[PDB]
Amino acid sequence: STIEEQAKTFLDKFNHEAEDLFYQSSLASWNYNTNITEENVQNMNNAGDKWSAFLKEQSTLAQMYPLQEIQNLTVKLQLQALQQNGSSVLSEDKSKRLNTILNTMSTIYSTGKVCNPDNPQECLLLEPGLNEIMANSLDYNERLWAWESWRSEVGKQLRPLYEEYVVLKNEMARANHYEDYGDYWRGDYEVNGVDGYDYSRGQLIEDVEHTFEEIKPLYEHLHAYVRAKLMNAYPSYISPIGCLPAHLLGDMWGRFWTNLYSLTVPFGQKPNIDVTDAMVDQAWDAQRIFKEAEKFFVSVGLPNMTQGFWENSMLTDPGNVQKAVCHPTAWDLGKGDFRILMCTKVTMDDFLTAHHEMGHIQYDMAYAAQPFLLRNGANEGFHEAVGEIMSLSAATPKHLKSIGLLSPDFQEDNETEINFLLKQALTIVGTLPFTYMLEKWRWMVFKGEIPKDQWMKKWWEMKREIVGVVEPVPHDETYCDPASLFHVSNDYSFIRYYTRTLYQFQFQEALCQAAKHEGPLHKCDISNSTEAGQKLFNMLRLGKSEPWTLALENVVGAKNMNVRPLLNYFEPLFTWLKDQNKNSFVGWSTDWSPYA
Amino acid sequence: ASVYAWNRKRISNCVADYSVLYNSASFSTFKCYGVSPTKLNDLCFTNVYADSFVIRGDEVRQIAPGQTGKIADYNYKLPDDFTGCVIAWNSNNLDSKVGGNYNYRYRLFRKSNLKPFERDISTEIYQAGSKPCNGVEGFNCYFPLQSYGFQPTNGVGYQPYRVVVLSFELLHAPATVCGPKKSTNLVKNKCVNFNFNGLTGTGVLTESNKKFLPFQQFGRDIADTTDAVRDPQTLEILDITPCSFGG
Ligand SMILES: *[C@@H]1O[C@H](CO)[C@@H](O[C@@H]2O[C@H](CO)[C@@H](O)[C@H](O)[C@H]2NC(C)=O)[C@H](O)[C@H]1NC(C)=O
Ligand SMILES: *[C@@H]1O[C@H](CO)[C@@H](O[C@@H]2O[C@H](CO)[C@@H](O)[C@H](O)[C@H]2NC(C)=O)[C@H](O)[C@H]1NC(C)=O
Ligand SMILES: *[C@@H]1O[C@H](CO)[C@@H](O)[C@H](O)[C@H]1NC(C)=O
């Protein structure tokens, strides 16, 4: 009666009831998200604590098992999920104080209140309106005022709150034998099993920027081009030596340059690739869109969709008193239950979103054969990257023409190719610097070697080197501008978005090579190539049973992260940028400011 | 019944029609290992044994010769040389409950693998470690019996399937169950060959006026040559004459 068999029997007892309870809870959650009503609300409680009232006890009894000698790596890894102290290591007062501070910070961040002084009785929130008006306009006064007001009424009273949150999170990190909460986050990309596949938390810190510097010549070029368009859009507001302010990026944070794409259009003569008029003319309902997505998925190589999903899952227009939130989600309710939740309509964007959600469902089924504690991806980014692969391949013009979205006699050329490529890069490679700098700043703030004074101003100079942003209004210590973001107060690791883009680029590039296609990467199509889908499913079926480094070995030949697909994809854009902004000089200056 | 309490039935002394069930589309799985389903109606055994229960959909492949699994080892076991057939069909519409078909249970833990054609219904608490589980479950205690979470939405694999396995025993005692025989029509005044109730021969059949006692089946005149028969259905006496021949 060795302890290994005792642990195996404990897992066998645990997993069945855990699956049953998780299935019940997920079914209730899906019902409430499909039936917005008070009756479905209390049910959450009736399950919620119960889940904990089942999980914590199993976590309570997952300590006397000596999880240090089990030969089966799968068994030890599965048991490691239950052998987690969590936040229970802290005292009750500390835990309740942390919970209260998280609640208040999230509520105050989500309840941003800015009233225009002319009409002080009508404030505006993060919901459309002020953000919508300032994100789509051509002005410097209103945008800057809105940015300052938002950073003032969210930053003033959250600086001590975020400080206390960070220090208590770090304290509980030491409470769980972690010298830093940054290491706690990096533990997702941490494996110490098979030799040659192990990864460490410290290595990832440098590896994140090791693949980041190579896009600096490209991204800056776009910025230079943007700056060129800035000299064609903003008269005497951005110096050619310097760069643009925060509120002129199109968003209050400047994560993406989509809001600035219209200003920086490369060639507006050629219309963009749009076939939504065809689906409206051809009467493409939600059913037709889902059927075509299913057919393309089958052509790729994934197994055909099963029944039950087409009836239980909602597809379009909650409509009447039977209301439902339809934010794009793919629900893996467990026990062989997979459903979609998204308002599908007659749009190519809705087509791509449906492709994304159903690819998420397919990936969920791919590792559904894994046990309850292994039915997840190797890391956070793999799920979203896999979901986005098919959406990327479902928008290629060749794919549209094959299923007859584009005209059968359509003819694309270099002008629309360059326009589309720049449009994609303005968001894809235009967000990597901001994501990397935010992740690094969060790494320092969790590690805490920087003092509390070195929070704002350091940020506001560091953003100069990476994102290329000047200060429209000063910020010394009286706000918390970085802390006033959605993925800063909800305890969300921000490296997932950085990793997802690189993973999806690598997978798309590898599929394009091993899919029998010729030409540029942006026009690559994986339709009717079942070998590529078979290799993709070989990757997907691993789930959590294999390390992420070992997972990154079937579709792609590199277990680590590389930047080569990023440069290869935007090759025509890079060679157009090289001879486009010849008059101006690339790079920005960190000394110039709009006020000086 | 339960998988570990499989319902056992003995069938003997009747005529068994197999093609009637074989020619049915309501059975999801129909696997025969002894002989072909068509040939089954020809030969016959001395008795039949039926094991009936309902299991999970994914476990149907577990019940087979040379197959192992939790059901195949701790709930019900079959030998490698099993003779007979297995018939399974979905019971999601009936057995699975909206509130959960937790009435059904399966044996998850057992000290030893079950023997072929053997049933275990023990409810003794199982022990996985050195600590003796004295009554109430402790650390190394796990219940052998686990319920079922059948729901209307559980995927095809989790739907409960009704499974019945038929085995045939042909002990040296006289056979008691056999398939239907099928009888043709009757002709007269023509040289034909016949197999009346297993008695075969050629000749021409005519109407006669002999008076059998109520228990004879045929008759012979002398030198032991059959001359008359009684048809098993109409129960009338027919006379046999050899077909004409000569030089
Ligand atoms: C998934 O695709 C396969 C391949 O077409 C489907 O299999 C056939 O589908 C057609 C039309 O959908 C039917 O007329 C055939 O009878 C199917 N044959 C078989 C052997 O299944 C399959 O039905 C599709 N899955 C679903 C749920 O529709
Ligand atoms: C075998 O079954 C047949 C079918 O019913 C029987 O034939 C009928 O028997 C009844 C009995 O009164 C008669 O009224 C009918 O006229 C018969 N039908 C015919 C001759 O075509 C037959 O008797 C049965 N054999 C038995 C009982 O030995
Ligand atoms: C949604 O919930 C309300 C409130 O309990 C109930 O009256 C209604 O029947 C529900 N509808 C569905 C489709 O479940």
CSV table of N, CA, C and O in Angstrom, one decimal, chain A residues 84-91 93-99 101-102 163-185 446 491:
chain,number,residue,atom,x,y,z
A,84,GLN,N,-2.1,23.1,-3.1
A,84,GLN,CA,-1.8,24.5,-3.1
A,84,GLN,C,-2.4,25.2,-1.9
A,84,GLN,O,-3.5,25.1,-1.6
A,85,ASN,N,-1.5,26.0,-1.2
A,85,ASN,CA,-1.9,26.7,0.0
A,85,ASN,C,-2.9,27.8,-0.4
A,85,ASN,O,-3.9,27.9,0.3
A,86,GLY,N,-2.7,28.5,-1.4
A,86,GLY,CA,-3.6,29.6,-1.8
A,86,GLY,C,-3.4,30.8,-0.8
A,86,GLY,O,-2.4,31.0,-0.2
A,87,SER,N,-4.5,31.6,-0.7
A,87,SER,CA,-4.5,32.7,0.2
A,87,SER,C,-4.9,32.3,1.6
A,87,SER,O,-4.8,33.1,2.5
A,88,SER,N,-5.2,31.0,1.9
A,88,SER,CA,-5.5,30.6,3.2
A,88,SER,C,-4.3,30.6,4.1
A,88,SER,O,-4.5,30.5,5.4
A,89,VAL,N,-3.1,30.7,3.6
A,89,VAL,CA,-1.9,30.8,4.5
A,89,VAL,C,-2.0,32.1,5.3
A,89,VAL,O,-1.5,32.1,6.4
A,90,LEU,N,-2.5,33.2,4.7
A,90,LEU,CA,-2.7,34.4,5.5
A,90,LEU,C,-3.7,34.3,6.6
A,90,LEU,O,-4.5,33.3,6.7
A,91,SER,N,-3.6,35.2,7.6
A,91,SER,CA,-4.6,35.2,8.6
A,91,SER,C,-5.9,35.7,8.1
A,91,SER,O,-6.0,36.3,7.0
A,93,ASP,N,-7.9,38.1,9.1
A,93,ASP,CA,-8.0,39.6,9.0
A,93,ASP,C,-7.3,40.1,7.7
A,93,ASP,O,-7.8,40.9,7.0
A,94,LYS,N,-6.1,39.5,7.5
A,94,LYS,CA,-5.3,39.9,6.3
A,94,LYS,C,-6.1,39.5,5.0
A,94,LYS,O,-6.1,40.3,4.1
A,95,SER,N,-6.6,38.3,5.0
A,95,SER,CA,-7.4,37.9,3.8
A,95,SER,C,-8.6,38.7,3.6
A,95,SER,O,-8.9,39.1,2.4
A,96,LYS,N,-9.3,39.1,4.6
A,96,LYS,CA,-10.5,39.9,4.5
A,96,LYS,C,-10.2,41.3,4.1
A,96,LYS,O,-10.9,41.9,3.3
A,97,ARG,N,-9.1,41.8,4.6
A,97,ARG,CA,-8.7,43.2,4.2
A,97,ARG,C,-8.2,43.2,2.7
A,97,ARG,O,-8.6,44.1,2.0
A,98,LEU,N,-7.5,42.1,2.3
A,98,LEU,CA,-7.2,42.1,0.8
A,98,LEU,C,-8.4,41.9,0.0
A,98,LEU,O,-8.5,42.6,-1.1
A,99,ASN,N,-9.4,41.1,0.4
A,99,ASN,CA,-10.6,41.0,-0.4
A,99,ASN,C,-11.3,42.3,-0.5
A,99,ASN,O,-11.8,42.7,-1.6
A,101,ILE,N,-10.1,45.4,-0.2
A,101,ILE,CA,-9.4,46.4,-1.0
A,101,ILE,C,-9.5,46.0,-2.5
A,101,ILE,O,-9.7,46.9,-3.3
A,102,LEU,N,-9.4,44.7,-2.8
A,102,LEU,CA,-9.7,44.4,-4.2
A,102,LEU,C,-11.1,44.8,-4.7
A,102,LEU,O,-11.2,45.3,-5.8
A,163,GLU,N,-0.9,50.7,-3.8
A,163,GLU,CA,0.2,50.4,-3.0
A,163,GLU,C,0.0,49.3,-2.0
A,163,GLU,O,0.8,48.4,-1.9
A,164,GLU,N,-1.1,49.4,-1.3
A,164,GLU,CA,-1.5,48.4,-0.3
A,164,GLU,C,-1.8,47.1,-0.9
A,164,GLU,O,-1.4,46.0,-0.4
A,165,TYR,N,-2.5,47.1,-2.0
A,165,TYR,CA,-2.7,45.8,-2.8
A,165,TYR,C,-1.4,45.2,-3.2
A,165,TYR,O,-1.3,44.0,-3.0
A,166,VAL,N,-0.5,45.9,-3.7
A,166,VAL,CA,0.8,45.3,-4.2
A,166,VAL,C,1.6,44.8,-3.0
A,166,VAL,O,2.1,43.7,-3.0
A,167,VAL,N,1.6,45.6,-1.9
A,167,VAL,CA,2.4,45.1,-0.7
A,167,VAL,C,1.8,43.9,-0.1
A,167,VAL,O,2.5,43.0,0.4
A,168,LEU,N,0.4,43.8,0.0
A,168,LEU,CA,-0.2,42.6,0.6
A,168,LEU,C,-0.1,41.4,-0.3
A,168,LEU,O,0.1,40.3,0.1
A,169,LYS,N,-0.2,41.6,-1.6
A,169,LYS,CA,0.0,40.5,-2.6
A,169,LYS,C,1.5,40.0,-2.5
A,169,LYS,O,1.7,38.8,-2.5
A,170,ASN,N,2.4,40.9,-2.3
A,170,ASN,CA,3.8,40.5,-2.1
A,170,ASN,C,4.0,39.8,-0.8
A,170,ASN,O,4.8,38.8,-0.7
A,171,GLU,N,3.3,40.2,0.2
A,171,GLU,CA,3.4,39.6,1.5
A,171,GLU,C,2.9,38.2,1.5
A,171,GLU,O,3.5,37.2,2.0
A,172,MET,N,1.7,38.0,0.8
A,172,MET,CA,1.2,36.6,0.7
A,172,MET,C,2.1,35.8,-0.3
A,172,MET,O,2.0,34.6,-0.3
A,173,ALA,N,2.8,36.5,-1.2
A,173,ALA,CA,3.8,35.7,-2.0
A,173,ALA,C,4.9,35.1,-1.2
A,173,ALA,O,5.2,33.9,-1.3
A,174,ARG,N,5.5,35.9,-0.3
A,174,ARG,CA,6.3,35.3,0.7
A,174,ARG,C,5.6,34.3,1.6
A,174,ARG,O,6.2,33.3,2.1
A,175,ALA,N,4.3,34.5,1.8
A,175,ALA,CA,3.5,33.5,2.6
A,175,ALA,C,3.5,32.2,1.9
A,175,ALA,O,3.3,31.2,2.6
A,176,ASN,N,3.6,32.1,0.6
A,176,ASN,CA,3.6,30.9,-0.1
A,176,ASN,C,5.0,30.5,-0.7
A,176,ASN,O,5.1,29.9,-1.8
A,177,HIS,N,6.1,30.9,0.0
A,177,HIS,CA,7.4,30.6,-0.3
A,177,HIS,C,7.8,31.2,-1.7
A,177,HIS,O,8.5,30.5,-2.5
A,178,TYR,N,7.3,32.4,-2.0
A,178,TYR,CA,7.6,33.1,-3.3
A,178,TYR,C,8.3,34.4,-2.9
A,178,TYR,O,7.6,35.2,-2.2
A,179,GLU,N,9.5,34.7,-3.4
A,179,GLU,CA,10.1,36.0,-3.1
A,179,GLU,C,9.4,37.1,-3.8
A,179,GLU,O,9.7,38.3,-3.4
A,180,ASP,N,8.6,36.9,-4.8
A,180,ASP,CA,7.9,37.9,-5.5
A,180,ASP,C,6.6,37.4,-6.1
A,180,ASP,O,6.6,36.2,-6.5
A,181,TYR,N,5.6,38.3,-6.1
A,181,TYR,CA,4.4,37.9,-6.9
A,181,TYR,C,4.6,37.8,-8.4
A,181,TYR,O,3.8,37.2,-9.1
A,182,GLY,N,5.6,38.5,-8.9
A,182,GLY,CA,6.0,38.3,-10.3
A,182,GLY,C,6.4,36.9,-10.6
A,182,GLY,O,6.0,36.3,-11.6
A,183,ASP,N,7.2,36.3,-9.7
A,183,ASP,CA,7.5,34.8,-9.8
A,183,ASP,C,6.2,34.0,-9.7
A,183,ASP,O,6.1,33.0,-10.4
A,184,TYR,N,5.3,34.4,-8.8
A,184,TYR,CA,4.0,33.7,-8.7
A,184,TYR,C,3.2,33.7,-10.1
A,184,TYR,O,2.7,32.7,-10.5
A,185,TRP,N,3.2,34.9,-10.7
A,185,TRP,CA,2.6,34.9,-12.1
A,185,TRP,C,3.4,34.1,-13.1
A,185,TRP,O,2.8,33.4,-13.9
A,446,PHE,N,5.6,44.6,-8.4
A,446,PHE,CA,5.5,43.4,-7.6
A,446,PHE,C,6.8,43.1,-6.9
A,446,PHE,O,6.8,42.8,-5.7
A,491,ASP,N,-5.8,41.8,-10.9
A,491,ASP,CA,-4.8,40.8,-10.7
A,491,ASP,C,-4.7,39.8,-11.9
A,491,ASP,O,-4.7,38.6,-11.8
